[PDB]
Design a protein around this ligand. Structure first.
Ligand SMILES: Cn1cc(-c2ccccc2)nc1CCc1cccc2nccnc12
Ligand SMILES: [Mg+2]
Ligand SMILES: [Zn+2]
Length: 313
């Protein structure tokens, strides 16, 4: 009850900033998450024993893959913490509760393979979930862990509040399917520009939370350059292993997943910044002005990839 989590001074200050990196000490990440819940939600949001048990069962259900691992889960939750703390009064009590949990759980039991590889392999999950295959699985794994004995962190909510928080989590996790991002952002662009965007409209709040989820999920592009650049190594280590597995099924992978085309990474990064990342943070900044530092950091990193192409690094 009177038991706050506290961080060393450097972490206490830098965790408030969008570009914070959670460090290489895996044993500090649970404490960092509980710290973020306590400040963004409250010390009363969750029973500490139940929250601690939930966190450790979530950790156990992330795999030892290069990128889609427990460090990614906590990194994506931190970017959501920074958005929530910079937009104090815009979000409901249930949204605060649901969204950090959603971020921690959003890639549960990821195998390091895309939806497209599961469909080509004919994985059983591709028959159970025909679209957003991995994301339906991540939500299914989240409900499983919530139903373990002593893992119900939402136990104090009414039956209808419980259904509402699980619906926030489900939509927030499905929104992390990048295939769905393009259309969501275009609709938000039109709504903002014609002045029809209304944050009391539930279907509009859903779209804005979906964009927050894309923004948090892609947040490696908003870090200091050395973090951005070293995270890109882990991203491609997964993609290139998927490309190898495409070659084993007798399918030429796309260049993004073919280790033989490593030389083209710098130009592939430019495409990605221009087609996905910069548009994401641009629309997010229009809707939520205090998220502008994410956009500024993304533009700084585009400029670094442009230097790499010019042979200036
Ligand atoms: C599009 N695209 C193409 C290529 C490419 C590379 C090599 C040869 C040919 C094409 N790389 C990307 C972006 C990779 C990428 C994908 C998803 C999330 C990412 N989040 C951060 C940084 N990158 C991310
Ligand atoms: Mg994912
Ligand atoms: Zn993710």
């Amino acid at each position: 009850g009177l038991m706050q989590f506290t961080l060393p001074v450097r972490l206490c200050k830098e965790i408030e900033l969008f570009h914070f990196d959670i460090g290489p000490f895996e044993n500090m990440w649970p404490g960092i998450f509980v710290y973020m819940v306590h400040r963004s939600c409250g010390t009363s949001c969750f029973e500490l024993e139940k929250l601690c048990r939930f966190i450790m069962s979530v950790k156990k259900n992330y795999r030892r893959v290069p990128y889609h691992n427990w460090k990614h889960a906590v990194t994506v939750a931190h970017c959501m913490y920074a958005i929530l703390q910079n937009n104090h009064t815009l979000f409901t009590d249930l949204e605060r509760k649901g969204l950090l949990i959603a971020c921690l759980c959003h890639d549960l039991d990821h195998r390091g393979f895309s939806n497209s590889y599961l469909q080509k392999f004919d994985h059983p999950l591709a028959a159970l979930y025909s679209t957003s295959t991995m994301e339906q699985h991540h939500f299914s794994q989240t409900v499983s862990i919530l139903q373990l004995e002593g893992h119900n962190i939402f136990s104090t909510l009414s039956s209808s509040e419980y259904e509402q928080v699980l619906e926030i989590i489900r939509k927030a996790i499905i929104a992390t399917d990048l295939a769905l991002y393009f259309g969501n952002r275009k609709q938000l662009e039109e709504m903002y520009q014609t002045g029809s965007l209304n944050l009391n409209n539930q279907s509009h709040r859903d779209r804005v939370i979906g964009l927050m989820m894309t923004a948090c999920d892609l947040c490696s592009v908003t870090k200091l350059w050395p973090v951005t650049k070293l995270t890109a190594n882990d991203i491609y280590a997964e993609f290139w292993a998927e490309g190898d597995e495409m070659k084993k099924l007798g399918i030429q992978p796309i260049p993004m997943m073919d280790r033989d085309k490593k030389d083209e990474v710098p130009q592939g990064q430019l495409g990605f910044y221009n087609a996905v990342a910069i548009p994401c943070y641009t629309t997010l900044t229009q809707i939520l002005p205090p998220t502008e530092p994410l956009l500024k950091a993304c533009r700084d990193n585009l400029s670094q990839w442009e230097k790499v192409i010019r042979g200036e690094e």
